[PDB]
Subunit: 263 residues, 4 copies
Amino acid sequence: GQAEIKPEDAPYITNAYKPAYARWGFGSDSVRNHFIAMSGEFVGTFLFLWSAFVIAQIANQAPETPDGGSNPAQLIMISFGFGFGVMVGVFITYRVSGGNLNPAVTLALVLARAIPPFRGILMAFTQIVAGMAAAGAASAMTPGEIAFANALGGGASRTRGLFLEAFGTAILCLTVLMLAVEKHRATWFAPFVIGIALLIAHLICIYYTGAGLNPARSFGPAVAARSFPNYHWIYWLGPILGAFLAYSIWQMWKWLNYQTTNP
Amino acid sequence: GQAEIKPEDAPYITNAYKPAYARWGFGSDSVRNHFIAMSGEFVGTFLFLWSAFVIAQIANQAPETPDGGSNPAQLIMISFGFGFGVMVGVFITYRVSGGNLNPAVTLALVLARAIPPFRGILMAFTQIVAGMAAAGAASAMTPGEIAFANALGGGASRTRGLFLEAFGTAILCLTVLMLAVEKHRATWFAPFVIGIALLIAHLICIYYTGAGLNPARSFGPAVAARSFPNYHWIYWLGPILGAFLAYSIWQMWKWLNYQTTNP
Amino acid sequence: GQAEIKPEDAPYITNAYKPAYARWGFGSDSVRNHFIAMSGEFVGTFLFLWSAFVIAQIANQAPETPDGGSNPAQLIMISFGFGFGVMVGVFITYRVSGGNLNPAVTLALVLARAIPPFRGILMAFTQIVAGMAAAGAASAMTPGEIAFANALGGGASRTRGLFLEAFGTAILCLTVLMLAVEKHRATWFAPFVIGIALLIAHLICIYYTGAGLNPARSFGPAVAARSFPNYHWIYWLGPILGAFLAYSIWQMWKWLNYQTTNP
Amino acid sequence: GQAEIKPEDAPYITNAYKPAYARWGFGSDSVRNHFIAMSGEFVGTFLFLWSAFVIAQIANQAPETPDGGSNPAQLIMISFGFGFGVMVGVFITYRVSGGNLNPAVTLALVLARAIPPFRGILMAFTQIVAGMAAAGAASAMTPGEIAFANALGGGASRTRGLFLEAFGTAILCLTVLMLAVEKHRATWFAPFVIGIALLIAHLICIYYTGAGLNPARSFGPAVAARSFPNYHWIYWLGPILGAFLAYSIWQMWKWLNYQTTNP
Ligand SMILES: CCCCCCCCO[C@@H]1O[C@H](CO)[C@@H](O)[C@H](O)[C@H]1O
Ligand SMILES: CCCCCCCCO[C@@H]1O[C@H](CO)[C@@H](O)[C@H](O)[C@H]1O
Ligand SMILES: CCCCCCCCO[C@@H]1O[C@H](CO)[C@@H](O)[C@H](O)[C@H]1O
Ligand SMILES: CCCCCCCCO[C@@H]1O[C@H](CO)[C@@H](O)[C@H](O)[C@H]1O
Ligand SMILES: CCCCCCCCO[C@@H]1O[C@H](CO)[C@@H](O)[C@H](O)[C@H]1O
Ligand SMILES: CCCCCCCCO[C@@H]1O[C@H](CO)[C@@H](O)[C@H](O)[C@H]1O
Ligand SMILES: CCCCCCCCO[C@@H]1O[C@H](CO)[C@@H](O)[C@H](O)[C@H]1O
Ligand SMILES: CCCCCCCCO[C@@H]1O[C@H](CO)[C@@H](O)[C@H](O)[C@H]1O
Ligand SMILES: CCCCCCCCO[C@@H]1O[C@H](CO)[C@@H](O)[C@H](O)[C@H]1O
Ligand SMILES: CCCCCCCCO[C@@H]1O[C@H](CO)[C@@H](O)[C@H](O)[C@H]1O
Ligand SMILES: CCCCCCCCO[C@@H]1O[C@H](CO)[C@@H](O)[C@H](O)[C@H]1O
Ligand SMILES: CCCCCCCCO[C@@H]1O[C@H](CO)[C@@H](O)[C@H](O)[C@H]1O
Ligand SMILES: [Cl-]
Ligand SMILES: [Cl-]
Ligand SMILES: [Cl-]
Ligand SMILES: [Cl-]
Ligand SMILES: [Cl-]
Ligand SMILES: [Cl-]
Ligand SMILES: [Cl-]
Ligand SMILES: [Cl-]
Ligand SMILES: [Cl-]
């Protein structure tokens, strides 16, 4: 009753589809390995954010909805751009850099000791530069005024926006921790779940905050539009708080040895 | 022709991605294990319902549709909030508590003897408290009046609503039973199927009942809005009936040894 | 480098998630086995079609679009009802009956010799009765006039409708053949692909034919509405032609030994 | 702790779900093998493009949006037609031809040495003929004027359109390279990721270029409509550039041995 694997098919079994950070042990601090990680974060973050910025630009050409009302089809389109955009970016870059594509995700993983702080800083810087590049490219490639920068809307206060951003980011980061960082039969599938988490977080946040959820996503368009709202700090503090919340929950479960009935 | 697994990749094979209730055997009645299960249900139910409540709040800011007509884009958005919200919550909590996130699901699994009654009661209480917390948080975080409480609509009577709720909940619970409780090559993927089942059940029910499908989902917003419709009982009895219907079907298939041609 | 499976996790490996028809060999002609197959087709077809009929009823309460124009959000909602409805029904019933849920799918599989003709006839009859029951239940549970019966629309002729139905059904049936009937590493996932195929086929057909794609889906509502259009035959002949087309393509690939470079 | 596979279930393990091009080694240049590859590309490309063309025809019957504005629901519908259409086509044809369904994808894979140039030319010709057939069939099967041919819109210049097409096609091709060509535990799932990549690329491009992303998709409708815009070259050069960009990135990662910490 033994599984029978033809030799030409062995790669599909032996080559695990696991995030790169799972295997960043001894040897990882070479310039080559730092470059590989940066290149994955750059390519992935650029393709994800560029895509999503153009999609948001288009969605924001819909006729205005009166009286500040919502436009569900518009919100769905934008959420697809970010959620499916990140899904594709993470699937592409999973074995290159792990596909964080988001400084807040990288922060959660530094807290969790999945990524060391220096590598994490390199990745976060790379993501922010990629988001600047993506914003510049999306602006150059589309007519009219930039429509993909984050802003408060829907009657939301800054305080409400901060909490929406924090809890939305926590959902994203907890997904990464429980599906990608934790090692199990579903780790390979984490990019899908991560994308759906981001899709949800956009349905929560776009109407009220524009959905930052990702300092690199918020910073780049502000640079390209040459304008920072005074409440721009919510797009930094909110995701940071969410990363700490997700980490906190994960850490509690780790100290409980959650996955094992009788440790 | 033997599969070849590098030692660093063994966790992805050896660590099954299975619901926690699959492995609640001897040792499960410790305070630690009860706490783990409650913490999974609390975190998962809170994140799922909070998300979905905010999404519903936003969707319900769309301009009114005349003459009681439906708004497909709005209904899709709300169904995504609940369906993808539960999907993410279940994927996160699958190995913590099994991700029931719904007293009716827990009831079906108690009937099926997948979860013992006392643990099931603890989980159900936890879900109801999480739904209260989620409703309070979603209300606090959003402007205007609560728009995520369940109500009859679309010309539906209470009796029609009861049956819609029951059959929708039965689809959800039968999905959990056949994909998560039954052990097979697709058990790991059950959270996806569960989410799509809930998405469908929302497309069936939102227009007519608001889509309860989950006593914890219905109770929390009623508390936060300080108002219970007199027909609130449909949001309890309907899901209970659906859990019994799903259990009944599963039990018939179990007594038939459905999966085996020659038992 | 050997895979290491804890005994409690062996069921997730040993219990293949495969369509029931894969394992209908000697012993299958018992009354028990016929009943199991019928019960899977009944439960699955009922839940799928009932769901989708209610969803279509609701979607068809949207305000009318002028000048016979299309309503993309409405079409998406209906396609989700059928596509995700069948996905859930097939995942639930895959190991019970194989989840055909459609006489045309059963016909394709009888042609392919995956299901014997007598069992296939039993399954097809069961599906048609389930569709009658689903139509009656959906009608009873919803106010107003039935809005889920198939009709020509969008300026389509009967001849155009026949071809749309045939090619849409062929996509569905070829998906079942190549993903579920053919045995490989992705067979477990066929219910997902089948659902997306049906979703596509609805986006092709609803506007023009109402999207039959399934004689059981078309017949039941006609009975419940007590009215058969004179062109009702397109909802039988079209899917039959599609089943033969899909079978034909599959059969060509089988005689070519498609999957093997050097047979 | 050894995995235990019943003999009747061995096919689901032993028969890898891998693109046909993975196994085009010695023996592949027979007429039989060329025919198999062409037949997969023809069937897959026809079903994908025919589906998507009819869906686009229908979506383009929505009432016009004033002032050149976007229609998110319409754009979502069209993107589903192409994205889910390609997903189904690739899943069906993965083990027949690999499911390229797109001359630009085939070009990327010829550059990557996954497919030899002569076979690649045969596949590309087949795709273009299939797209002609699909356009003719979709036109014949639908009333009114063809509405599925590519055109600039949304205020986009040809230069902007060229870049949108190139970067969108690069996302698609990089997905194919990293998920299908690279051999790992997720290769079987590549058809899903490919479909989502195409879905994203449509949300980026439809409003501005009509979304070519695929010379076979653009050429066929131009033939059927008997009209080529003078900027039709963007639908060739853009996807070609995108294929080269994707190849370039992949090639850099291959020379870095990206997947291995210590080569
Ligand atoms: C002399 C003390 C240590 C020698 C160098 C050890 C290098 C270990 O390197 C690690 O090997 C693992 C496989 O075992 C891989 O999964 C990791 O990617 C790699 O970082
Ligand atoms: C990442 C590289 C993206 C290059 C996109 C360049 C597209 C330039 O596009 C041009 O922009 C001008 C305004 O700047 C318009 O006047 C032109 O009509 C438009 O073609
Ligand atoms: C032999 C005397 C010891 C008495 C302690 C009974 C503790 C029962 O509790 C058990 O403790 C185990 C750790 O000891 C855990 O692994 C189990 O999960 C827990 O149920
Ligand atoms: C003295 C009589 C019984 C001794 C204690 C038995 C504890 C069994 O404990 C069970 O072990 C299984 C693995 O075998 C795990 O899968 C379960 O999670 C665990 O509950
Ligand atoms: C789970 C914790 C959620 C905390 C959210 C608190 C957000 C409070 O938000 C405040 O609500 C007031 C009305 O109550 C408004 O007047 C303020 O403008 C708004 O900022
Ligand atoms: C040797 C005399 C016994 C005659 C009974 C013939 C029953 C044939 O029926 C078989 O019965 C088996 C159980 O017996 C089941 O496992 C099979 O599914 C069923 O087909
Ligand atoms: C006396 C001549 C034949 C004896 C009865 C053979 C019954 C075979 O039965 C078949 O066994 C397979 C496993 O081998 C199962 O996968 C099938 O479900 C079952 O139909
Ligand atoms: C499968 C069983 C479904 C039972 C649904 C029965 C719902 C009956 O519903 C009733 O229908 C009457 C019209 O017939 C209306 O007058 C009532 O107001 C409505 O409650
Ligand atoms: C030794 C003389 C025989 C000459 C025939 C050369 C045929 C080469 O063709 C090969 O034929 C094989 C079957 O024979 C197939 O399996 C291969 O796919 C095909 O490439
Ligand atoms: C005489 C020199 C070579 C003899 C013919 C070798 C044919 C190899 O053929 C290859 O075999 C692989 C399995 O090993 C398959 O995966 C490939 O599909 C096939 O192309
Ligand atoms: C791939 C084969 C598709 C065959 C579709 C043929 C459908 C022909 O359809 C006919 O087209 C005529 C205009 O040409 C209309 O006048 C007819 O009313 C319509 O039935
Ligand atoms: C023994 C003297 C050699 C000194 C070189 C130290 C290089 C450390 O760097 C290591 O180089 C290895 C290749 O050599 C790579 O596989 C590792 O990824 C890299 O970290
Ligand atoms: Cl404030
Ligand atoms: Cl899998
Ligand atoms: Cl401020
Ligand atoms: Cl009533
Ligand atoms: Cl009442
Ligand atoms: Cl006609
Ligand atoms: Cl007729
Ligand atoms: Cl130009
Ligand atoms: Cl030109």
